[PDB]
Symmetry: C2
Subunit: 133 residues, 2 copies
């Protein structure tokens, strides 16, 4: 998966979970992309077997698509939590995560996860960190 591919699967996952389906119109709006570009990507993902097209619904995710999707959602969520814990401007967190999410090994994600846990279990660690700012 490329960065674009990962953003599409993650965005299709978010849509099924929150609403109940993925149509190309919703993808185009959400991702800030042209509708025909979504078509060419849906093709790639279908052939690479990340998704199926159901007839009177829209895009459904395969078994593989859903495993990848949930992993992508988790990663984005953790990175946001991480930048929020460390004190990054709220306005900047989403732009940072949008870019950095594709360029970290899972080993880094594993370790960022442990770092989040470190701060979550003792509030005094967070206060100490914030005193340095």
């Amino acid at each position: 998966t490329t960065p674009s591919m990962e953003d599409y699967i993650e965005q299709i996952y978010m849509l099924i979970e929150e609403k109940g389906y993925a149509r190309v119109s919703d993808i185009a709006e959400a991702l800030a992309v042209h509708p025909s570009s979504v078509t060419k990507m849906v093709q790639k993902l279908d052939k690479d077997e990340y998704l199926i097209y159901e007839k009177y619904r829209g895009l459904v995710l395969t078994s593989k698509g859903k495993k990848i999707g949930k992993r992508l959602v988790y990663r984005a969520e953790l990175l946001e939590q991480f930048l929020r814990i460390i004190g990054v401007d709220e306005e900047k967190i989403y732009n940072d995560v949008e870019g950095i999410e594709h360029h970290l090994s899972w080993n880094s994600i594993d370790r960022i996860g442990d770092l989040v846990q470190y701060f979550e279990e003792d509030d005094a660690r967070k206060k100490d960190l914030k005193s340095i700012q």
Copy 2:
């Protein structure tokens, strides 16, 4: 500056500091790039006034090029220190930093810097973090 542009300036800075000059041969080898691609980039950076060409030397950095270069070197160094502190596999740190460095605001770098300081001033914080792993 694009990601490629930032990698070129940072790599030209590292070369002047460590050796004494930047030639295109050294850039091509270091960046894993074709020699004629370096030429087309040196052109961009010259026109955008990040570097000059001195006659019996090679690429020298402008005033602007050196300010940017040192900022890029600092950022890469801090991110490595950061991933090292959090326990990322040594083999993976450089690949992660190579990618993520271009997609973080300075506000994030400022805050990662404070996080590094947090761990550097009390060794017990590091031990606590490592016990979670």
